[PDB]
């Protein structure tokens, strides 16, 4: 309607399509159901939920006068969205750790076909996400805010009541420290170590081999650059929304809303906050070669 909803809809559609094809490949193509791949598909699920929980959340924030799903509606929606975001971040950092352990320490490969271990790890990650989301779920609620420009009230979600603004702030900070600082730092260090190891391997592997080793060298350099750009995209996508939420929590302006140009900014952040969800599948699509083959096959 405002020339921006179309871009958000297209992003959500492409992300849903990517994640759906990814899960369909993981299920149908059993050959790709190895030990680590579980984690990968887990992320997709999270992403799916996020996307499946992103359509309504925004659909009610824009092109609407006030909240629609009600009190329990906002409760469950915020709970599931925060759980999906936490699961996504945790699975991303776990995949980074696994790639680090496999590339930097290739001789320490764990036992294969141990699907039970990865399943228990994913279950623990999901449980930790749900536990860390329970606070906002129990404290979230729909409240009315006044608008002096309109001289009327409008209902909207709030992770905490206005009477405990400070509390909210603290939570927000914690969320940041738990969703941006430590995850970004660990992913960055792991990807840097992986890229350094890949470069040292490309330098160590025989380069004189006639058109047989240079191909692997180029592939290793390409995947190293991809891994290095992954963390950059993750940061550029999760910094805008984090700063937006920090501003909203530190301000917590009640009975008044600054309806300035800020609108575009926040929604822009949202788009970026979702771009990463679409980058994770395609990222993998860029890593391997036969992966693209069976992806286009199932697609």
């Amino acid at each position: 309607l405002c020339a921006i909803y179309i871009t958000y809809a297209v992003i959500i559609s492409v992300g849903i399509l990517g994640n759906a094809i990814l899960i369909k490949v993981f299920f149908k193509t059993k050959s790709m159901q190895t030990v680590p791949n579980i984690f990968i598909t887990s992320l997709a699920f999270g992403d799916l939920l996020l996307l499946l929980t992103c359509v309504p959340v925004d659909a009610t924030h824009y092109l609407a006068e006030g909240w629609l799903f009600g009190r329990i509606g906002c409760k469950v929606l915020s709970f599931i969205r925060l759980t999906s975001v936490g699961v996504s971040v945790f699975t991303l950092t776990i995949l980074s750790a696994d790639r680090y352990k496999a590339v930097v320490k290739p001789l320490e490969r764990q036992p294969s076909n141990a699907i039970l271990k990865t399943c228990v790890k994913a279950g623990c990650v999901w449980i930790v996400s749900m536990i860390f989301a329970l606070p906002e779920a129990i404290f979230s609620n729909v409240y009315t805010f006044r608008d002096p420009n309109k001289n009327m009230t409008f209902e909207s979600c709030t992770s905490y009541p206005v009477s405990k603004k400070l509390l909210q702030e603290i939570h927000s900070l914690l969320c940041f420290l738990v969703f941006y600082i430590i995850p970004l730092s660990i992913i960055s260090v792991y990807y840097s170590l992986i890229a350094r190891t890949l470069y040292k391997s490309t330098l160590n592997i025989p380069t004189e081999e006639q058109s047989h080793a240079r191909k692997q060298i180029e592939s290793r350099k390409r995947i190293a650059r991809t891994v290095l750009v992954l963390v950059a995209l993750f940061a550029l996508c999760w910094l805008p929304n984090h700063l937006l939420y920090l501003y909203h929590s530190f301000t917590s302006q009640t009975y008044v809303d600054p309806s300035a140009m800020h609108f575009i900014f926040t929604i822009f952040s949202r788009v970026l906050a979702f771009s990463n969800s679409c980058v994770n599948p395609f990222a993998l699509y860029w890593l391997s070669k036969s992966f693209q083959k069976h992806f286009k096959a199932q697609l």
Partner: peptide, 9 residues
């Protein structure tokens, strides 16, 4: 507004 003034994601 509900785009306005709160809530993560």
């Amino acid at each position: 507004x509900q785009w306005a003034v709160x809530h993560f994601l």
